[PDB]
Ligand binder design. Structure first.
Ligand SMILES: NCCCCCC(=O)NO
Ligand SMILES: NCCCCCC(=O)NO
Ligand SMILES: [K+]
Ligand SMILES: [K+]
Ligand SMILES: [K+]
Ligand SMILES: [K+]
Ligand SMILES: [Mg+2]
Ligand SMILES: [Mg+2]
Ligand SMILES: [Zn+2]
Ligand SMILES: [Zn+2]
Lengths: 343, 345
């Protein structure tokens, strides 16, 4: 019914530390997320499961800068060579009133290229991010060659990464890369709808001055939650992108009965935009038991979500983003896929 | 010669257990034994009278720092604990390139808005210690304004990295900038702030960047290589009326006193043409050959030379203690600066 792209190289990203609440804890973004979703895909016989193709850095550099990609390739080696004993974590950054100037030292490069210290880098992070982008691009290729939809089971996630900024467990913006691939292959207009609990600030920034890619995100109020410094309802674009970005914000305890009204608004905006392709940055951290979020979606609500998304009648690429209740992450994500397929 | 020292026991209220460094949470370099060791050496050398600081209130602090920032520093630990966080208060997210410089409601976002680094944990007593350290600087300033040639403000925590509303690099209130601004508010026409700490005094540079009445000079390791990385380059000379009233002098690894003192001489010449009415020296002894996080190679006697050269400027002078992390020698080095100033070279 629906094909899934999955890479075993996702396990190459397996850091031990995440800065949270002043402590170094287990990262929330652990490989069992992807393994559990894959297990549910197999158990439900959703459809064919495929490994990604290697597309190289070309399609990645359509969205990210060359300096940033190079930095991501050398960062761990430079970190170890500089004598640091922990995993690679930024300690200093460009505070307000300082210069956005790229320095030489690895600590300064880490700070320049990051928006948060919650995303440790270790050996294999480069390879895993590369594989995740290739997963998204393979889903896009499946859709471009005839499939109604495809599930890019990406890990690590991507929607927080700017053209040259990483953070929030993201390195390469898989959804933005897929959308730009659609554009490069002759799709006139693309819509990116972000249903993850957090604002897709990287995707918003990448296309902020463009009208050929419409960016919509539903998320918890950034006054309250990550990413804090983007995602407010007054961010509607700039330049040619004016009115081609839409942020829809919700407060704590929001259930599906209210969240789905924002989803309906997003769907109406997409219909007037009338895109040639749709990329859905899917996060299941909207779940009522997600340990770092405050929405109250149930598991069946994801079936409803998939159904409503299918009714858009578009070629659709799903890129896996967040979701951290590992017990139910497979049921929730595959529930979106099956609801899309009519279950 | 004699020099008076201001010291507050409330510095001990600054007692964090963690510092983010190299991907690990380590024991902080900026530990209370720094101040206790300097004080012990002050006593053993009988440098002069030791006094506790006066409480000047928030007035003189708010001449330099914004009201929102001072309030934030007062409430930060309480909000952090009330929000359920289990470690010390450390920023995790900040305004990355391409995001909005907008103050949010959540304590994490406020921590990021008001910080330039995650190396400076906030815990219980940090507010009280920072207030006391600012009061140490202001009391030294009062001693100088009322007749003393010079005074040693044994500040802890240090201050020269703090902007008007940004903390980091172990700093919360910019004690040196507060002392300079107190000088200005008391009728001193022009003030010079000379930063001999190993790191760039970026907060002091920022506070006075568009002003010509306060000349800011700093000697430091190349920010291309070391903290604070994103300010301190030699092309930062001021803005507006402050153009040519900030001077950064950068040095590479392994720099000894024979080369460092050439930059110091350049700074002294700049001060000479500036001809200020008062001088504040942000003193760090992390230029020492054994300092564990810096790469200059000054000896202990070099600080005697430094103090002597500083006295030859002939100005009313306030020393504010900044960095320096080899605790074995921190007292010898700092007090060596004071005694060299008083002629014990
Ligand atoms: N460490 C704070 C969480 C960062 C973003 C996580 C996420 O799920 N984004 O979609
Ligand atoms: N954790 C990085 C070092 C920041 C403190 C620098 C200093 O001592 N300035 O005086
Ligand atoms: K979202
Ligand atoms: K756009
Ligand atoms: K300095
Ligand atoms: K100035
Ligand atoms: Mg470094
Ligand atoms: Mg928070
Ligand atoms: Zn999320
Ligand atoms: Zn220093």
């Amino acid at each position: 019914s629906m094909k899934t792209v999955f890479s075993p190289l996702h396990s190459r990203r397996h850091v031990k530390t995440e800065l949270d609440g002043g402590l170094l804890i287990e990262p929330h973004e652990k490989p069992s997320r992807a393994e559990t979703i894959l297990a549910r895909v197999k158990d439900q016989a959703l459809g064919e499961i495929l490994e990604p193709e290697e597309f190289g850095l070309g399609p990645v550099k359509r969205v990210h800068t060359a300096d940033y990609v190079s930095f991501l390739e050398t960062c761990w080696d430079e970190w170890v060579a500089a004598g640091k004993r922990g995993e690679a974590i930024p300690t200093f950054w460009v505070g307000r009133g300082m210069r956005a100037r790229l320095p030489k030292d690895i600590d300064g490069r880490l700070g320049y290229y990051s928006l948060g210290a919650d995303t440790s880098i270790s050996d294999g992070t480069w390879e895993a991010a590369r594989a995740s982008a290739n997963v998204a691009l393979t889903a896009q290729k499946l859709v471009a060659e005839g499939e109604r939809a495809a599930f890019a089971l990406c890990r690590p996630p991507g929607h927080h990464a700017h053209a040259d900024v990483f953070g929030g467990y993201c390195f390469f913006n898989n959804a933005a890369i897929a959308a730009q691939a659609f554009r490069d292959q002759g799709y006139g207009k693309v819509a990116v709808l972000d249903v993850d609990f957090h604002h897709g600030n990287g995707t918003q920034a990448i296309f902020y001055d463009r009208s050929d890619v419409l960016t919509i995100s539903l998320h918890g109020d950034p006054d309250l939650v990550f990413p804090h410094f983007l995602g407010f309802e007054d961010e509607t674009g700039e330049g040619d992108g004016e009115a081609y970005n839409l942020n829809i914000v919700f407060p704590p305890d929001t259930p599906f009965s209210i969240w789905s009204q924002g989803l309906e608004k997003a769907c109406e905006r997409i219909r007037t935009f009338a895109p040639d392709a749709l990329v859905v940055a899917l996060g299941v951290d909207t779940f009522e038991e997600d340990p770092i979020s405050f929405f109250k979606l149930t598991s069946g609500d994801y079936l409803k979500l998939g159904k409503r998304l299918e009714q858009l009648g578009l070629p659709t690429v799903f890129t896996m983003e967040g979701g951290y209740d590992v017990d139910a992450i497979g049921v929730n994500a595959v529930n979106v896929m099956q609801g899309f397929e009519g279950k």
